[PDB]
Design a protein around this ligand. Structure first.
Ligand code: YS4
Ligand code: YS4
Ligand code: CL
Ligand code: CL
Ligand code: MG
Ligand code: MG
Ligand code: MG
Ligand code: MG
Ligand code: MG
Ligand code: MG
Lengths: 342, 342
């Protein structure tokens, strides 16, 4: 497993990230207290996950750049850029958890639920985003791909926030939205909210960093990565409800939050008129007993087994796309990622 | 007044901003609903203010670029970049209003307080930020100053969020923080939270757009603009409490929110031990009668008249800095802005 190999090292480079981001304090002591808060926000919200998106940059980089070109500086930039993807994720999750009324994340209480944090987390989240661009400037400003990386991170963020917009609009609090929960809609939501930043961005970044700038090469990689991202979000939805919370580190809120989840979409395709009514009466509400009825409806329709089959067909489909579209990139770049997610 | 001249026109270019930002809908109909939400967010949160920061870009641009170089394209870019500063402001204010528990902004209920919006405004706010970078790409990507503008907007945002961090840390809910409310601290907060983005950014952008890229020229402009921004935030603080809300369009929350306001700092410098105790018992709390005691303490110490004097000395001080530092830029660039704020 190429990720488990590169990980310890990736994770160790976090203290240098924090050191470099908290050196502004030297030039300007007056911002001491803010930088201290920044460190606390980084330590709490950037550590504790699996680091798959960040590690994808490092792994891809190693596989795409001739080993003679992997000097100490180039490696450090690679890890820095991986850490940029992780900071983007931490930005996103801190704000998402507020918007989804979540309780826990990565096995600890959500940053916004900490006493004395609350809605100040809005600013915390945006500070994490700003750190991305400070890191890129600090480590990559003289590199021919600098502008490419900046634009990629900006554009990936815009797309993801369009995603999030679709997510929120399809899931209004207090309104039954079952009619809106279609396969077509679901696929759009997850393409935008998840697939661009979690799959396309880290591989593209490593591509740019290796001087692979071509529009056709990016687009082919993209065909594979967006389908992988679709599956990853579908797995995420399944795990919100059926996942083991000691493994996931997070309590589910999709049913309560009236979300267009893969589960509810599959439910809707399979439900009798009577079960449609159970869903209609119970979905999108805070009451634990109403959430449990929805779960029981999902179990009665064998949705876990529908997911298991979907995982199998999807895996095959993605492997097919790797056969079609990897070239001229090493198939290993996509395979090691698929292994990681399936 | 060069602003009142350029305004109608600036404001008219907003429908083209919205048109260009909602054309993504052509390529990708699946994001139709999101783009529609984006339009509603822009219409609600980018219109209704005075447009001073955006207009500063246009005004400065006209004054800094030889009129033979002001072709239709260059003007359109100038107005576009002004609109970028306005979108940055709208981002900031939408999220700030959530964090400060505000009620109204620009004479209407705060976007987050609208029924059916609530904390979804977090995403709305970030979408406004993303629009900045999409506009820059769309209009300025081929210009020699593109990277300069991107970095300036990113860096200005980081600095402002460091500011906001200091603001929030100095003002914890439920804790007396009087000891922390010093002149030294106040000056740092406002330099970072207000002065960079509201004063330095729009003039710098116009500078870059005119090919004025030099470090010394930017730094001189900066000496003038950050002192102007300090005064603007001090005026903002005074107006939170003493301003006429039919003019300001916003209800004050500084005392309730336990803020390190210029008012409270001036109070602290002038208070007897007994008045110190009144402030200590009444500051930073939601109760209307406790807020009214604080106001009455401010009036008893003649703080409105202290502000009026400060406005006079500050104006003189800024004019002194214009005599020192404008050159080789036209003094009019700084004067027309000062007129606008004082
Ligand atoms: C500006 C900020 C609000 O933008 C975003 C913040 C978060 C996200 C996002 C994207 C993909 N997954 C998540 N979180 C998951 P998770 O909460 O981890 O299950 P989801 O809530 O979609 O089920 C968040 C997208 C955009
Ligand atoms: C990421 C986002 C939270 O960052 C910021 C959002 C807003 C601000 C900011 C800066 C300057 N003035 C304001 N608003 C004023 P106003 O509410 O308009 O009186 P303040 O609340 O400081 O008295 C907001 C700074 C940063
Ligand atoms: Cl699990
Ligand atoms: Cl007034
Ligand atoms: Mg969530
Ligand atoms: Mg969510
Ligand atoms: Mg989820
Ligand atoms: Mg405010
Ligand atoms: Mg504020
Ligand atoms: Mg204010």
């Amino acid at each position: 497993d190429v990720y488990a190999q590169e990980k310890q090292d990736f994770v160790q480079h976090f203290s240098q990230i924090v050191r470099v981001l908290t050196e502004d304090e030297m030039g300007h002591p007056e911002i001491g207290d803010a930088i201290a808060r920044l460190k606390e926000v980084l330590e709490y919200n950037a550590i504790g996950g699996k680091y798959n998106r960040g590690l994808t940059v490092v792994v891809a980089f190693r596989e795409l750049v001739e080993p003679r070109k992997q000097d100490a500086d180039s490696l450090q930039r690679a890890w820095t850029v991986g850490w940029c993807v992780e900071l983007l994720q931490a930005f996103f999750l801190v704000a998402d958890d507020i918007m989804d009324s979540s309780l826990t994340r990565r096995g600890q209480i959500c940053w916004y639920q900490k006493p004395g944090v609350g809605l100040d987390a809005i600013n915390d989240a945006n500070l994490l985003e700003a750190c991305i661009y400070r890191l890129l400037k600090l480590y990559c400003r003289e590199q021919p791909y600098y502008l490419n990386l900046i634009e990629l991170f900006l554009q990936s963020s815009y797309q993801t926030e369009i995603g999030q917009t679709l997510d929120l609009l399809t899931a209004p609090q207090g309104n039954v939205d079952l009619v809106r929960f279609t396969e077509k809609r679901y696929k759009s939501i997850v393409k935008y909210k998840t697939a661009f930043y979690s799959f396309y961005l880290p591989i593209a970044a490593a591509m740019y960093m290796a001087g692979i700038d071509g529009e056709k090469e990016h687009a082919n990689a993209k065909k594979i990565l967006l389908e992988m991202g679709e599956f990853f979000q579908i797995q995420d939805d399944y795990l919100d409800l059926f996942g083991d919370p000691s493994v996931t580190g997070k309590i589910g809120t999709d049913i309560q939050d009236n979300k267009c989840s893969w589960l509810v979409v599959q439910c809707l395709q399979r439900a009798t008129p009577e079960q449609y009514q159970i869903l209609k009466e119970n979905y999108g509400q805070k009451e634990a007993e109403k959430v449990a009825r929805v779960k029981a409806l999902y179990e009665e329709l064998d949705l876990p087994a529908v997911f298991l089959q979907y995982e199998e067909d999807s895996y095959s489909h993605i492997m097919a796309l790797i056969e079609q579209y990897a070239a001229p990139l090493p198939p290993a770049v996509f395979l090691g990622l698929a292994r990681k997610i399936y």
